[PDB]
Design a protein around this ligand. Structure first.
Ligand code: ATP
Ligand code: ATP
Ligand code: ADP
Ligand code: MG
Ligand code: MG
Ligand code: MG
Lengths: 471, 478, 471
């Protein structure tokens, strides 16, 4: 094993030279650890990722930290293996970066902890699972309009609307309470304040003791945001293939992953394409998302909020992710145009779980009734806009009667951030919520004020709060 | 003496290509044997692509550069208070050069994630609309965008001026601002008396693109030293669009590949470094705090553009100004519909949290119903009361230029019943009503607002219901 | 004593290679003199300017002529000094090309006259004027809506065929004859016949006595269209510096200056921006516009008629020159078509002269009310076009009825407009403009026909017009 030399630097892209014979392969982890020779120099500690072979015994790499301080002629140490992250019952509760260094600040991982490669091919078709298990999320809207397939993949792609972060934060707590399985939350480009708030919330709640997270500072060079989420996937892979206990995973964003990769891929890349994006965006994203799949041994279920620039879904970067999600909540404005939040589009959001033979038709009948009563408003809203008088030239009668009032009964209050709004709330299962659904569809409480069906927990809560609120 | 001396080959467009420098370290400062500065950015295989800081007329071929090994630094210190300086530190208004010797690297690591806190300290902007509807903490990163001459600079001026009774230091960074306009702003600041704390850094149009690029970094670097001291620092930008334009020009000159709409790839990794060096520091690093108000220009509020799309995803809150509303009579044209704030509630006092929790709902409902009733013929009169109340409460959310209204006087006017008292002639009463009410409180009921100042929460409403009744009786109807 | 030989010739861009180390500095005028050495050659006396140093002792230059007849191997003469212009009181009344040589057939300036190189740095901070006073013109719209600041900058954006040149000429008529100080007109990239049509007109009028005229027209090469503005600007800066007199400054079309870069810089080897404009567009425009400022030694009131290609205000050329003007008016082609002149946009045109603390509280009130009415009238066009007129409320029936009157009372006839039609012009005071807008605002003249308010001056003219017409 010999050493290498640095030749040229452009932005975060850094070139490395090597002798013949000991040339490292692609995706190998290259590490630089020098010291200052004299006063005109500054100490540097940084690691690199191999991308290309340009011939002439040269290799083009990228960085994982700030490149300020790199000087031509440095000695480059080759490890020979891809970046490796500790796995096992050592990582439960810690806070890791892209390299695997625990910034949790309690201590440093032992040098012989089981370290596994980040990059490897996804599991093959030979054994992929097919069972459809439904998860009771405990939120009426997600359980009704498009219930989540526990084991597949769920994606709150919201078209980059405001109102996702809070939803993921609430889902963490309530789903973890539902099933105390292993949980992992990874952020590919983070509002550092939001990341710290989530860490403090988890530590206060106590669920941090049975979870593990990796945070990518959005100020880090695009190498970290390109290769961060694979750390969470690797840890989930370990916890699935080592103990069989079913694991649940979160992703804060994927579009920022694509963008951060795209910038470097175009800087050193062959040529641009699309709207200035990568040439290999589809393959890069497919190799990542295709690893999150339920298997014969165990199941991985993930929640990924997706950013969509300018609220235009024709963007290829999210447009290519649709095939990788089995339950899509197209939030868009998510009724932030109305006072309502964070409701998911009541008709556009779709999933695989909408089937009488998958959910049991006892819920499908109620889903039918709710769909029919609530879809007709916007279907005739553009007409009632002009015909907004007291006239009845339109047979929109019961739709105007119900639509807004029952849309108001599409928001939960049990564990909201009272620091952000202040309202209390109580938990609700869909099993007992179907009773309130049948009651509202048959119209027992059509005489109650519309403001009394808004921001409420359960049907008994609605009726009692309505009776108390201005009778 | 030991050094590594280069050789200048190509000169043009404020760019110099140097060959040699076996000991060249990326990002260092270098001089061109003519008293001018320079920076090294593109360390190609056999030549160094140096970027010229300042005038480049005197440079030709054959000149030799001298290494310095100095990471690009800017002086900081307490003597900068009240100074207007070039991003290198030298003042532009004479007054003798800078005095403090403490320096910091322009490119420095950002504060760690474990060292921050849930920002729970309000900021007293003093403008009614932004105060009530879009709160600002002491470490938040609010974004302000809009069209030309929609009042963004006026919002910045009001925000910086209102800091007259707090522990805040305000840092102004005018990127691309015309020099005469910068002089006018300095004169207004001196006329209002805010130079006792303000550090203003200016970079004219005539200045080179490298300086226009490095100016915001110099401002934030100056802010960071006061941050670690334990103070609170406010940093206000200008024309990050022009900052991005300068960086795009530099990247195109250095022959880097261009991305979409000619902007280089690392624009986002640049803006993230620019913005994410502001937060709240816990006691573990000193109880400091720093908030920033980057500004972005746009055409008619069109947010489809690449730079606004890159910026809005970073900032914790976006403030929209529209000339459409501004010419309509809403002089502080804060578009309350599309303006959000990810620190809502926790950035408002225990009184504003009580009173303003319904005003945004009322305004949204007013716009919701008036969208249906953009024409007022044969309307359903049952819902018209809320339309009237929204119309007569939106009138409250505006104030004239150079008028910072204190939160204590503001909370009474935006009280959840003050949005719903008499309003006998609301189309014209309320404007003089609020001024005569402030005078009435300051001459008769100063104790009422003294309680608000001392408590940060509402007193018993009857104790102020009496004052409201007395003011209604005394005030002359219109 | 340095000599060079031409190497590479590409259109209006010419290369020269000089002796080692003895290169001329940047921005030095290079003269090419030659005599026809046979029947197959042409005499050439041509000038160049240094642009770039591109390695191996090469110099890449630009030319101020057609570059026709250059032969690879022609010898090069270096003057060593930038392009110089005759300067001082000698040039009063004269006409010059870009190079600084007269063309008015009045012989030539003596060869020993004082002269100054063009290029120079911008003023510093301490010598910038802070006070603001109003310079009034006589046109109703500019007098009221957006006053012209003396000692600031005024720009007149407009399309092709909207009337920026007419506005410039009428402003000359209104201001120049009644000022009493140095005046400078520097035509750049305009219709060439305007040179005669303005030179002989000013000679006939008499104001030619104490004016300076610089003519770089369209047919001239891109180098000339670049440097003509700088020549005129230095000629004006001399009088703003050394004599302290009040100096006026006109620029027919400064857009051509920044456009000629789009023609040259492509040959110079720079890659383009999104639009064909050069990547340095910001720097050249800034370094030119910064030299036009007010100092403690004098006052410059510059009027610069910026052209906007394709009527696109998202074009970088207008979209980045907004920040350099303290007052402006935008000319609307749509308003021009439907019979309104000078067709100044009332809602898009703004300025920083408009403030209640200066023009008066009642003046500010009138301006704000006019803007309100015009804004609402502009907004209601969708309703008017889609679903008729009388579907509005009763109030809007009067708001439109007054806005239609206002946008026509803003019209006027000009002394220049005496040549398009025989009807002469008028001169209006600001006090009576304000009073007339008031009397329209409280509906004193809503009974008069709406279309009778076109083509008037002060309110008495429309009164007597409604009197004279039978209707
Ligand atoms: N709320 C307001 N009250 C009073 N005057 C205002 C208000 N907003 C803007 N103006 C006035 O309108 C003009 C707007 O200019 P200003 O530079 O302050 O705005 P801007 O939107 O920041 O513009 P710029 O494009 O230069 O950034 C000024 O003359 C200012 O005095
Ligand atoms: N104030 C005005 N009164 C009457 N007619 C006008 C007025 N302004 C413009 N026009 C009409 O519009 C025409 C515009 O002519 P002008 O040469 O000024 O065009 P332009 O838009 O400045 O374009 P360019 O400079 O490219 O020729 C005039 O010849 C005249 O017919
Ligand atoms: N569940 C919710 N309840 C109430 N307000 C909400 C909710 N979700 C979002 N909001 C509104 O949006 C803000 C938070 O938006 P956030 O979810 O952080 O946006 P993003 O996902 O784009 O980061 C809150 O302060 C509030 O104004
Ligand atoms: Mg988020
Ligand atoms: Mg401004
Ligand atoms: Mg014309």
């Amino acid at each position: 094993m010999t050493r290498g030399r640095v030749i040229q630097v452009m932005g975060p892209v850094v070139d490395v030279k090597f002798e013949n014979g000991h040339l490292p392969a692609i995706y190998n982890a290259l590490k630089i650890q020098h010291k200052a020779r004299n006063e005109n120099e500054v100490d540097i500690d940084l690691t690199l990722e191999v991308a290309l072979h340009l011939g002439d015994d040269t290799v083009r790499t990228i960085a994982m930290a700030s490149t300020d301080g790199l000087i031509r002629g440095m000695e480059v140490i080759d490890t020979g293996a891809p970046i490796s992250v500790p796995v096992g019952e050592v990582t439960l509760g810690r806070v890791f970066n892209v390299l695997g260094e625990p910034i949790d600040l309690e201590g440093d991982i032992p040098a012989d902890a089981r370290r596994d490669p980040i990059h490897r091919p996804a599991p093959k078709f030979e054994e992929l699972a097919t069972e459809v298990e439904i998860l009771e999320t405990g939120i009426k809207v997600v359980d009704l309009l498009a219930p989540y397939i526990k084991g597949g993949k769920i994606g709150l792609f919201g078209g980059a609307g405001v109102g996702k972060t809070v939803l993921i934060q609430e889902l963490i707590h309530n789903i973890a309470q539902e099933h105390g399985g292993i949980s992992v939350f990874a952020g590919v480009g983070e509002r550092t304040r939001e990341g710290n708030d989530l860490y403090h919330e988890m530590k206060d709640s106590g669920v941090i003791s049975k979870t593990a997270m990796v945070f990518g500072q959005m100020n880090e060079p695009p190498g970290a945001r390109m290769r961060v989420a694979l750390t969470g996937l690797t840890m989930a892979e370990y916890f699935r293939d080592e103990q069989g206990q079913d694991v649940l995973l979160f992703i804060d964003n994927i579009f920022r992953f694509t963008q951060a990769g795209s910038e470097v891929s175009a800087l050193l890349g062959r040529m641009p394409s699309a709207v200035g994006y990568q040439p290999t965006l589809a393959t890069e994203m497919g190799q990542l998302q295709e690893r999150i799949t339920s298997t014969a041994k165990g199941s991985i279920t993930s929640i990924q909020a997706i950013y969509v620039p300018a609220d235009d879904y024709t963007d290829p970067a999210p447009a290519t992710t649709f095939s990788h999600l089995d339950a899509t909540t197209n939030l868009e404005r998510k009724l932030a145009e109305m006072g309502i939040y964070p409701a998911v589009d009541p008709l556009a959001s779709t999933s695989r779980a909408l089937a009488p033979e998958i959910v049991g038709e006892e819920h499908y009948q109620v889903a039918r009734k709710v769909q029919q009563t609530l879809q007709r408003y916007k279907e005739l809203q553009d007409i009632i806009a002009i015909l907004g008088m007291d006239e009845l030239s339109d047979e929109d009668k019961l739709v105007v009667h119900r639509a807004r009032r029952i849309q108001f009964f599409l928001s939960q209050n049990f564990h909201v951030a009272e620091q952000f709004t202040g309202q209390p709330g109580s938990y609700v299962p869909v099993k007992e919520t179907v009773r309130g659904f049948k009651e509202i569809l048959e119209g027992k409480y059509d005489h109650l004020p519309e403001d009394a069906f808004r921001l409420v927990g359960r049907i008994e809560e609605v009726v009692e709060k309505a009776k108390a609120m201005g009778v | 003496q030991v050094s590594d001396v280069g050789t200048v080959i190509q000169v043009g467009d404020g760019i110099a290509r140097a060959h040699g420098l076996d000991n060249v370290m990326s990002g260092e400062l270098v001089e061109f044997a003519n008293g001018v500065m320079g920076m090294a950015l593109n360390l190609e295989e056999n030549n160094v692509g140096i970027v010229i800081l300042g005038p480049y007329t005197g440079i030709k071929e054959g000149d030799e550069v001298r290494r310095t090994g100095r990471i690009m630094e800017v002086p900081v210190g307490e003597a900068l208070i009240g100074r207007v300086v070039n991003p290198l530190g030298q003042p532009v208004d004479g007054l003798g050069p800078v005095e403090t010797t403490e320096t910091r690297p322009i490119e420095s690591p950002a504060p760690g994630v474990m060292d921050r806190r849930s920002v729970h300290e309000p900021l007293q902007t003093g403008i009614k609309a932004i105060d009530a509807l879009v709160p600002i903490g002491r470490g938040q990163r609010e974004l302000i965008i809009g069209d030309r001459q929609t009042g963004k600079t006026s919002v910045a001026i009001d925000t910086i001026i209102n800091q007259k009774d707090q522990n805040m230091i305000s840092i102004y960074v005018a990127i691309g601002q015309k020099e005469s306009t910068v002089r006018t702003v300095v004169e207004t600041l001196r006329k209002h008396g805010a130079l006792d704390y303000t550090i203003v850094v200016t970079a004219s149009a005539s200045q080179p693109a490298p300086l226009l690029f490095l100016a915001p970094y110099a401002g934030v670097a100056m802010g960071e030293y006061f941050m670690y001291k334990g103070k609170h620092v406010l940093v206000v930008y200008d024309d990050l669009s022009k900052q991005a334009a300068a960086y795009r020009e530099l990247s195109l000159l250095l022959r880097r590949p261009p991305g979409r709409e000619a902007y280089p790839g690392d624009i986002f990794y640049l803006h993230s470094r620019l913005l994410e060096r502001a937060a709240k520091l816990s006691d573990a690093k000193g109880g400091g705090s720093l908030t920033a108000l980057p500004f972005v220009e746009t055409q008619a509020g069109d947010i489809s553009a690449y730079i606004p799309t890159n910026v809005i995803s970073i900032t914790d809150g976006q403030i929209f100004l529209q000339s459409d509303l501004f010419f309509s009579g809403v002089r502080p044209a804060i578009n309350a519909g599309l303006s959000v704030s990810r620190v809502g509630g926790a950035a408002q006092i225990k009184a504003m949290k009580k009173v303003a929790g319904t005003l945004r709902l009322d305004l949204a409902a007013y716009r919701e119903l008036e969208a249906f009733a953009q024409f007022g013929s044969d309307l359903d009169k049952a819902t018209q009361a809320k339309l009237a109340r929204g119309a007569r409460t939106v009138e409250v959310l505006k104030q004239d230029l150079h008028q910072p209204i204190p939160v204590e006087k503001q909370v009474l006017i935006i009280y959840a019943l003050t949005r719903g008292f008499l309003d006998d002639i609301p189309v014209e009463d309320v404007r003089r009503f609020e001024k005569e009410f402030y005078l009435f409180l300051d001459q008769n009921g100063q104790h009422l607002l003294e309680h608000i100042r001392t408590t940060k929460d509402l007193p018993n409403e009857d104790d102020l219901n009496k004052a409201i009744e007395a003011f209604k009786k005394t005030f002359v109807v219109s």
